[PDB]
Amino acid sequence: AKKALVHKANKKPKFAVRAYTRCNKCGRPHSVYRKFGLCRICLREMAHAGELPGVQKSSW
Template identity: 50%
Template sequence: MAKKSLIQREKKRQKLEQKYHLIRRSSKKKIKSKVSPLSLSEKTKMQEKLQSLPRNSAPTRLHRRCFLTGRPRANYRDFGLSGHILREMVYACLLPGATRSSW
């Protein structure tokens, strides 16, 4: 089980990312737009606006965690579970369609 403080920090990052998503996307789109070439000063203003946003609002700072334990590593995207918990659930026949490997 992950520390609760780390899980809460991740939830806070998710809220910040959702809050600033539109602002971040629109400012990036204006910087990269080739239709209306911005002057250098306008472009730097847009970059400063982008940099003034909180760091934790960037989507690259988000990290997937296990739905049950909060483990940050070995997560399966399809299930939202870590490999350890996924294996236990397959052995307990709690995941339909998943089979145990045996050789």
Template identity: 50%
Template sequence: MAKKSLIQRENKRQKLEQKYHLIRRSSKKKISKVSSLSSSERWEIQVKLQSLPRNSAPIRLHRRCFLTGRPRANYRDFGLSGHILREMVYACLLPGATRSSW
């Protein structure tokens, strides 16, 4: 089980990312049209982007296990970490997933 403080920090980052998503996306679109902008206009847009909170960047989000909060070995399809997924498959709690046997 992950520490509660780390899970809360991740939730805070998700909220910040949702809050500043539109501002960040529009600024990125403006920068991508670099040929029509002068260097000073581009610089102003970059300053605006850098003034946003650091934790509002989507790259800082980390996927966590739905049950345990584990940050590593997560499967996107299920939202679970590897060992929890394996336990659920062995307990026949995931339909369509089969155990490996050879």
């Protein structure tokens, strides 16, 4: 992710329809969860490291 573009997206857009997610840790535009604010791979890494309070392996 280009840092120019990620900072630009963080900057308040001139219109309300120009806002989107941009995963914070890595700035991936696609495949990002709204609740956590992190993308697929970031969620994977945090969960496997166990540093995210509440995520765990699922097996039912």
